[PDB]
């Protein structure tokens, strides 16, 4: 730990970040990089990735290409910079605010920041304005992209080969199943428009002020260009209807592409959260999420 602490400061050092030693904090990590927060000798504060793997140019270049679109076009929130990006370090100084909550991953729970039984309003007005411009970043020009793009049809045969590819696997309970064919089959219901997703918004990566405004965005690892719908299911899960309605909303009264069947097809998204979950533990092994797939998909 004065080992791994000794550790932090040298790989710093090296890319002449210079930290104040008593200010280093290890973070909940994963088996790709270790989490760090620290402040320099100018009293910002950074977050580090260290590595845990090799190849991480490979690993991170749909991410640093999502998070290069977001800084050279997004004004109305933060999203991180990699000032520091090698295959030793990536660091990046560490956006305001607090996220609006974090899981609790032993009780399945988050920890909230804001009141859950009176989500302030500008959660909503905020996060869709974020959204709205996120949305509509012209990500085709770019020269060079390797991030997922779809068009609207697309889209929805990712949705239906996932499904499919989930059933193989698993199985999936037949009324389950029927929805989501039903929800494939009904071509109304399907977006028109696709465009850059963030990808995995939820309260712990919706950096928020004092006054619930959402002012930034991490993670930005699951970006993509595909139905911007992924985006508000967040909303539904954890304020219900009425918080899915505001986001809807909000987005759509700033001029984020809304079609009449919106909130019913994020309803039907929601509804193949099984699809997520599933993938999640065929790929991470996790028996958790084996246990927690099998249950949603009602088999
Ligand atoms: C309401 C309260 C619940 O929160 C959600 O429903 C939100 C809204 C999910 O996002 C929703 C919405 C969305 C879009 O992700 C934001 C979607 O992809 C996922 C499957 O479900 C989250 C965050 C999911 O995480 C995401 O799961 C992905 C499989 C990988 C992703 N990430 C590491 C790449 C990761 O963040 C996931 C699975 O539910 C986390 C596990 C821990 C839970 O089961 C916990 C206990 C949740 O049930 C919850 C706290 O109770
Ligand atoms: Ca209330």
Redesign the pocket.
Known sequence: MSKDIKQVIEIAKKHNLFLKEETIQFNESGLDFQAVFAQDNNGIDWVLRLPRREDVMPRTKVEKQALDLVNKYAISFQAPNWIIYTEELIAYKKLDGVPAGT?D?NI???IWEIDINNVPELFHKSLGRVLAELHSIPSNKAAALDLVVHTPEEARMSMKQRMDAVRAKFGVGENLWNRWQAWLNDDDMWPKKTGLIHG???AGHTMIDKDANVTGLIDW??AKVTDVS?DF??NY??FGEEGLEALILAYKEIGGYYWPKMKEHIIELNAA?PV??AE?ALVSGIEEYEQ?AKEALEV
């Open positions: 899981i991953h399945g729970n988050y995995d918004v939820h690892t699951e992924h299911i967040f899960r954890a959260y997520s979950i999640f927690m």
